[PDB]
Design an enzyme around this catalytic site. Structure first.
Site, PDB file in Angstrom:
ATOM      1  N   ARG A  45       0.843  -1.196   0.000  1.00 53.29           N
ATOM      2  CA  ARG A  45       0.000   0.000   0.000  1.00 53.29           C
ATOM      3  C   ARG A  45       0.881   1.251   0.000  1.00 53.29           C
ATOM      4  O   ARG A  45       1.707   1.430   0.900  1.00 53.29           O
ATOM      5  CB  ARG A  45      -0.892  -0.025   1.252  1.00 53.29           C
ATOM      6  N   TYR A  48      -0.857   6.861  -2.832  1.00 50.47           N
ATOM      7  CA  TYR A  48      -2.064   6.890  -3.664  1.00 50.47           C
ATOM      8  C   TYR A  48      -2.236   5.615  -4.512  1.00 50.47           C
ATOM      9  O   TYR A  48      -2.819   5.671  -5.599  1.00 50.47           O
ATOM     10  CB  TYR A  48      -2.140   8.172  -4.526  1.00 50.47           C
ATOM     11  N   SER A  49      -1.745   4.465  -4.013  1.00 49.20           N
ATOM     12  CA  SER A  49      -1.864   3.193  -4.728  1.00 49.20           C
ATOM     13  C   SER A  49      -1.924   2.000  -3.793  1.00 49.20           C
ATOM     14  O   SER A  49      -1.470   2.079  -2.656  1.00 49.20           O
ATOM     15  CB  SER A  49      -0.723   3.019  -5.729  1.00 49.20           C
ATOM     16  N   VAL A  51      -1.290  -2.299  -4.224  1.00 46.08           N
ATOM     17  CA  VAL A  51      -0.739  -3.301  -5.133  1.00 46.08           C
ATOM     18  C   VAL A  51      -1.219  -4.683  -4.749  1.00 46.08           C
ATOM     19  O   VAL A  51      -1.149  -5.077  -3.582  1.00 46.08           O
ATOM     20  CB  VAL A  51       0.806  -3.217  -5.218  1.00 46.08           C
ATOM     21  N   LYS A  66      -1.811  -2.763  -9.945  1.00 49.86           N
ATOM     22  CA  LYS A  66      -1.637  -1.574  -9.122  1.00 49.86           C
ATOM     23  C   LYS A  66      -2.883  -0.720  -9.295  1.00 49.86           C
ATOM     24  O   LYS A  66      -3.111  -0.188 -10.379  1.00 49.86           O
ATOM     25  CB  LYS A  66      -0.384  -0.805  -9.559  1.00 49.86           C
ATOM     26  N   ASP A 154      12.632   8.180  -7.735  1.00 50.17           N
ATOM     27  CA  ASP A 154      12.171   7.507  -6.489  1.00 50.17           C
ATOM     28  C   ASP A 154      12.963   6.213  -6.287  1.00 50.17           C
ATOM     29  O   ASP A 154      12.359   5.195  -5.949  1.00 50.17           O
ATOM     30  CB  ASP A 154      10.651   7.343  -6.434  1.00 50.17           C
TER      31      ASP A 154
END
Length: 325
Positions: A45, A48-49, A51, A66, A154
């Site tokens: 988690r 904003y997603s 999986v 996702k 990222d």
């Protein structure tokens, strides 16, 4: 104002391509039907997603799904386009399908199956060779996506999936990734705190692919020294202080003077004065089997304040540390 900067490699790769490649806002997304997939279990988690591991019911193949919280359409379009462009690249997660729930219409990205060995379980069994091997695998992904005019922004352990049993590495979560344009000013609110390069912490917006090289150096330092995270900041301002405690304050002032960066007043009382530390200080009985002169020389060439002075992914691939791979 601040001194402009540009990447030393792949500077103009997007300038020489048609707008359709980097113009994600104008990209037409063909959203398929989610009915071909059945959700199996939660994998993770994000902000904003969410999986999931799922099964494609038309061929009995496991996939990764996702599910995105649609807070910004431009961000979704950006991620899809980047994924599409990188599709098939080495050690890059593979976009398989783009689907929406017929009812909730929540956007979802379907990826080809990726397995991940637990980091704590891997950390204990890792050898000097494994670190070199996997570091080379990540460099293949980074040199490719940088050559494709994209910066991941990222790079962190949680975005690096490693299936140790099959020796497979996948660089995942391209939701913060961006197209590099020489001279473009970017939002510095990207990357996880511990992996934020000095350019983001001093609010220098004209950064490039070298941001990913800082992040990679952070992961390497944490791996070879068994110190997770290597730079343990408690906030974004403290993050720069934890870097200064290792790299020293002299080279930080030289960096800000070179680029004429205006340091935020919040740094005045917290930076202090710090000497540059020797990399050999972080070596101990518990980590010495992962450390070597080559590893330290390689780390020293990634973890530099000056983003222009850092090794490029291609230069990093030619370092003596990878002669054994």
């Amino acid at each position: 104002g601040p001194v402009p900067s540009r990447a030393r490699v792949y500077t103009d790769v997007n300038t020489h391509r048609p707008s359709e490649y980097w113009d994600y806002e104008s990209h037409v997304v063909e959203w398929g039907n989610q009915d071909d997939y059945q959700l199996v279990r939660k994998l993770g988690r994000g902000k904003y997603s969410e999986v999931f591991e799922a099964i494609n019911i038309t061929n009995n193949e496991k996939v990764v799904v996702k599910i995105l919280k649609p807070v910004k359409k431009k961000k979704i379009k950006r991620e899809i386009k980047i994924l599409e462009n990188l599709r098939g690249g080495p050690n890059i997660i593979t976009l398989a399908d783009i689907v929406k729930d017929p009812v909730s219409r929540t956007p979802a990205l379907v990826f080809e199956h990726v397995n991940n060995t637990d980091f704590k379980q891997l950390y204990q069994t890792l050898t000097d060779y494994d670190i070199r091997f996997y570091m080379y695998e990540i460099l293949k992904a980074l040199d490719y996506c940088h050559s494709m005019g994209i910066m991941h922004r990222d790079v962190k352990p949680h975005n690096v999936m490693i299936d140790h049993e099959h020796r497979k590495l996948r660089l995942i979560d391209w939701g913060l990734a961006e197209f590099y344009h020489p001279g473009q000013e970017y939002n510095v609110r990207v990357a996880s705190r511990y992996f934020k390069g000095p350019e983001l912490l001093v609010d220098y917006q004209m950064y490039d692919y070298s941001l990913d090289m800082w992040s990679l150096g952070c992961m390497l330092a944490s791996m070879i020294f068994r110190k997770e995270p290597f730079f343990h900041g408690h906030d974004n301002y403290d993050q720069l202080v934890r870097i200064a405690k290792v790299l020293g304050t002299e080279d930080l002032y030289d960096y800000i003077d070179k680029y004429n960066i205006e340091l935020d007043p919040r740094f005045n009382d917290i930076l202090g004065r710090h000497s540059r530390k020797r990399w050999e200080r972080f070596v101990h009985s518990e980590n010495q089997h992962l450390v070597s002169p080559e590893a330290l020389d390689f780390l020293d060439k990634l973890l530099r304040y000056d983003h222009q002075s850092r090794l490029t992914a291609r230069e990093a691939m030619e370092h003596p540390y990878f002669y054994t791979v």
